[PDB]
Amino acid sequence: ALKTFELRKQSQENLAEQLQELRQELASLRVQKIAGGSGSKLSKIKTTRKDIARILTVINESNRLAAREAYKNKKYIPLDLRQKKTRAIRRALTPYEQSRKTLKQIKKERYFPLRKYALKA
Amino acid sequence: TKGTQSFGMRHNKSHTICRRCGKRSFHIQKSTCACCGYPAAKTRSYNWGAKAKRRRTTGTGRMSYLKKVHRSFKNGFRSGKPA
Amino acid sequence: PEYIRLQRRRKILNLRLKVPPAIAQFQKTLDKNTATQVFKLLNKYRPETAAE
Amino acid sequence: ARVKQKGKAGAARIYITRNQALKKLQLTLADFRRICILKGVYPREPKNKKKANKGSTAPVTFYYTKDIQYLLHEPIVQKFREYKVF
Amino acid sequence: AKKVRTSTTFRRPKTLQLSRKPKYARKSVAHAPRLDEYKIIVNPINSESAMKKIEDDNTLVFHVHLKANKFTIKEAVRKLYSVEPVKINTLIRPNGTKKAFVKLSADADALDVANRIGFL
Amino acid sequence: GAYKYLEELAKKKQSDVNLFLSRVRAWEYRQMNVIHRASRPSRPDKARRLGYKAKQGYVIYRIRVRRGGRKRPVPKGQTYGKPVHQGVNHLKYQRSARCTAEERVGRYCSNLRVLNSYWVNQDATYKFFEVILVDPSHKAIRRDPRINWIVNPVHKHRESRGLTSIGKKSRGIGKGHRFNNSPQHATWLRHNTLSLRRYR
Amino acid sequence: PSHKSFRTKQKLAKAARQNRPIPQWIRLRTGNTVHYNMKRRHWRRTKLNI
RNA sequence: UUGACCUCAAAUCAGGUAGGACUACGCGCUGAACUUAAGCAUAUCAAUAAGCGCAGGAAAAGAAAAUAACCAUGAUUCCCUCAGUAACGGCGAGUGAAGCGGGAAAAGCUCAAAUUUGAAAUCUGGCAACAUUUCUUUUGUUGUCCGAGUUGUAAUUUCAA
RNA sequence: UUGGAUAUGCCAUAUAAAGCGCUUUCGAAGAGUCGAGUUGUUUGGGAAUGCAGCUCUAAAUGGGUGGUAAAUUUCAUCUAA
RNA sequence: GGACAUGGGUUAGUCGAUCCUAAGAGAUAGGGAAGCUCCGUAUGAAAGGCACGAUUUUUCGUGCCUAUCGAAAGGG
RNA sequence: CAGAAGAAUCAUCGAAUCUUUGAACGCACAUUGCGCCUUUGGGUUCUACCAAAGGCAUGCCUGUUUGAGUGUCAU
Ligand SMILES: [Zn+2]
């Protein structure tokens, strides 16, 4: 079985040959299944399918991380790379601009804050 | 007041499949779905048809996104990979 | 176009209608020779620019 | 497929006249000549000028649409617009 | 200099239409070709009528993708089996799957090519 | 300042100056569209005291609303009921035309928040209103502590839910015995609820 | 009729595939409570109504 | 003639935003009839159902153009009480609040109208730098240009002053 | 992972800002809005309770309100648009 | 056996659909409407083009003039 | 059942995929219908044909750019 960690520590072009070889192997296995194949071949069909899925996952994550590195510290970045929590969360006021205050309120909070007090018995 | 001998002339659809709701309720000549109101932006919906609402309301389908959102809410909408 | 007709018929309307004295007093403006000399005085006392 | 209409492919597709190139590039005649000086872009006459003019016979200077398509992505054109703003 | 109007119509003037110069690409990564030859050709057909077409008409019969057309089937066959077809016919089966008859050239033997694929 | 003079002059709208300005403005507002963007407020001090600041993110729209009462939309003026419901003509919309002006502008600019609005003109067919609008996505608004409150999602379509000044006026919000119907559904629901305690 | 739309043939193709008997190895499973297809259709008896 | 400005347009211009669903509970609009009155037209049902619009995790309301007539109380909301009471009603059927008082919870405030005038002190955006992160996904800072803004953006003031 | 304290480190131009106290002083306070008539619709509101349409349209110790309409004169209270 | 089960089976440059318009539908401009939505289809719209030039104050000048859907019997 | 051999029809879940559609957005649609833009690539075939990728809805807001006006002037 193809394991993701040595899949990740290779290059994109090398993984391209592995992906194409796996696709050809799946095509051969499907031809074997329709011409009459054993359970061993039919089990290799699902194994090859998952190996293709693992490789395609590795290509996509390498591509996305490269896009993240290229767009790091950029004011505008691709939408799919931005946050997706909820539509409302993205539309809400940020904590910075929720906490913005006038100089009138800054003076009031500076000079007369809520005091820590206690009462004697 | 004509029954048989009059049902034999019925071979002309008045409704076809709707592209939005998938039901055989799309009036051809009106170009409107009697079920969901397509092509209107809103969905045909009426409070007298309470059973009609529950036949197609939220949860009767897959809710694939809403299930994902609920899982993400339970853990606080965090992003990144665990260390 | 409609906006050009708006401009010109507004100009016509102000000419046709009876303008009140408090509005028509702005139709009597400064003369050219007085205008150039007062603006000559003003360009000596323009306020400082943002760069200055 | 249906009947294809004439003047849609071949010489009538790969060749472009000077005025349509102006409209294609959204440039004035002086500015279009400027980038044609800077880049290597010169008239190229079709072997069948009448066919490349979509049947018309009026005398026309022709450029490759490939050359004009290339001029669409030239950063100098944006610099011309920047100077006009300046 | 008052401009002379000779049309009695005012037609909206033509203004510069800048092309799009985005500050960011909306998609970070371009999708791979969604229909490549391994997805275009699903399986060959080995039914008795399919064999008959192979052994007489020099024609290969394939289960192909729904979105595959005649051009894409020819390119897929050429790239997957190194044999150039001379003719392609397609039909949607009553089960909803597309089937392509691929007539090979006299240069190629459909029997041999079927043997290399392995379903013969 | 000149805003004081503008306010006391606007009080005198039967003067020759205001009557002339009403004529010319009503003519040119009819020649424009029913809803058209106003480049600047025609009553800058009226807009100013209602909440309009002259910075990016604030918008003014002029809208003319057809005056008169409401016409029952029943076909052929027929009601099919008891004689206490046969009126078709002399019926009145319960929201003001100023509310109607606000809510039509609010639909026209769905990306904006309706701050408030003011009367600017009227004739025998229309009453002309100017609606003050705020862009909630604009950073100049999002960073101003005096106007952030309208960016919050609980203020979407204030005018549609009756939360603008004229909207609260139309639904009878007020302090004292004169109202006592107050929030109508809330007040009606408060009494008509039959509170059955556990021990009774 | 012979003249069909592509959309109709898709719905007809799925209707044909759903109008089949159940695999036999389904009936041997642990906790299986399915014996016969309860959604079977015949072309005279029940119409697809599309 | 060039320019300035105003107004109004265009662009697959740069960056954003709106719809739809949901609707138990929130705010509105629109709006009946069966029913009751042993008939029935005012009335009742009901400021309800149906219809339509717009929200939130609550909504709405809210710091008195409020009560009271006291030795006076003191934003709003909800509970109990007031109270089936004052009152409305072919004064018929029926309908029907509020102040006080007790409790739950408590929190206060912001502009407009002022000449900064020895100094637009204010802010969006482009660019470049750094920094920061529930987060390479988030949020800012500083500099520099372009603009917005004197037809008024900051500071100062809100009647309790 | 978060919270409020604590130990110090660094950055912070009070050349600032603020509360309080007395003024022989001054004190800007939101208009087709208030109010009135009228017509609908509402309310327990009854000589209109609120809302709306139309007509008329304020004021400057002025304007509201004090649950029987009017004129007048006081008194409380509150300070809308 | 049109029933039950298992497989198989429909190949197009030329045959149709697609293209065109018909009655008619239906956006847009606008105007109504508390609204759902209604009306409206070249209308009270700035509703788009085409050509010439030693390159013009290397900041463009000079001329010339209607969506869409809707026919497997219509047109092609 | 067959079948192979960090297993699993395991749980969790912060990274991804997410066909044709749908408010549904190029125009449509009882038509896998009809278009346009940019880039790239293909092959006995190269002015041809084809393929792939990325785009083209409306309203409104800030800004930019290009404008129009017997609108207001300056000059
Ligand atoms: Zn439908």
Domains in chain A, number: 2
E96 is near strand J: CB distance < 7 Å: no
Rounded to 10 degrees, what is the CA torsion of A8, A11, A12, A16? Answer: -90
Same domain, A52 and A2: yes
Cis preceding linkage at B39, omega within 30: yes
Q: Which chains touch A (3 or more CB pairs under 8 A)?
A: B, E, F
Strand F58-66 and strand F126-134: the pairing is antiparallel
| Domain C-terminal end among A40, A60, A75 | A75
Same domain, A9 and A53: yes
CB atoms within 10 A of CB F69: 9
Chain A residues 14-73 within an 8 A CB cutoff of chain B: none
Same domain, A35 and A87: no
Same domain, A12 and A56: yes
- How far is the C-alpha of F61 from the C-alpha of F29, rounded, in Å? 11
Determine A/E contact with 3+ CB pairs under 8 A as the test: yes
Token pair 């092509």 is at which residue?
Answer: B39
Cβ neighbours for D70, distance < 8 A, ≥ 6 positions apart: D39
Q: Which nucleotides of K are covered by protein (CB under 7 A)?
A: 1-4, 6-7, 9, 13-18, 21-24, 29-32, 34-35, 38-39, 42-45, 47-55, 59-75
- How far is the C-alpha of F180 from the C-alpha of F175, rounded, in Å? 8
Same domain, A33 and A89: no
* C-alpha distances out from residue F161 to B28, F90, F103, F114, F166, Å: 38, 26, 10, 11, 11
Taking the CA of residue F53 and the C1' sugar atom of nucleotide H22, their distance in angstroms comes to 37
- How far is the C-alpha of F103 from the C-alpha of F47, rounded, in Å? 18
Domain range for A115 is 76-120
Same domain, A60 and A97: no
Same domain, A24 and A58: yes
Specify which residues F116 forms β-bridges with. F132
Same domain, A80 and A54: no
Query: Which domains occur in chain F, in start order?
Result: 2-171 (3.40.1120.10)
Contacts of A24 in chain E (CB under 8 A): 38
Classify G27 in phi/psi space as left (phi over 0), alpha (psi -120 to 50) or beta.
alpha
Same domain, A41 and A9: yes
Q: How many CB pairs under 8 A join D and E?
A: 3
Half-sphere exposure of D37 (CA within 13 A, CB side): 6
- How far is the C-alpha of F150 from the C-alpha of A55, rounded, in Å? 49
Nucleotide nearest to A94 (CA to C1'): H139
Residue from D36, C4, D16, D84 nearest E16 by CA: D84
Half-sphere exposure of G39 (CA within 13 A, CB side): 9
DSSP letter string, B1-17: ---TTTGGG----SEE-
User: Which experimental approach was used here?
Assistant: cryo-EM
Is B35 assigned a ligand-binding role in the annotation? Answer: no
Amino acid at E51: M
- How far is the C-alpha of E53 from the C-alpha of E70, rounded, in Å? 18
- How far is the C-alpha of G18 from the C-alpha of B4, rounded, in Å? 33
Same domain, A71 and A84: no
- In degrees rounded to 5, what are phi and psi of residue F116? -165, -175
DSSP letter string, D32-81: HHHHHHHTT------SSHHHHTTT--S---EEEHHHHHHHTT-HHHHHHH
Same domain, A92 and A69: no
Residue E111 in contact with residue E120, Cβ under 8 Å?
Answer: yes
Q: Using a 7 Å CB cutoff, list residues 13-42 of D near strand J.
A: 17-20, 22-23, 28-31, 33-34, 37
Rounded to 10 degrees, what is the CA torsion of A66, A67, A72, A76? Answer: 180
Same domain, A70 and A100: no
* C-alpha distances out from residue D63 to D17, D38, D60, D79, G45, Å: 6, 16, 10, 23, 70
Token pair 């025998």 is at which residue?
Answer: F124
- How far is the C-alpha of F41 from the C-alpha of F20, rounded, in Å? 18
Residue from D63, D69, F153 nearest A92 by CA: F153
Q: What is the resolution of this structure in A?
A: 2.8
Give residue G48 CA to ligand 1 midpoint distance, Å. 17
Domains in chain G, number: 1
Domain range for G26 is 1-49
F27 is near strand J: CB distance < 7 Å: no
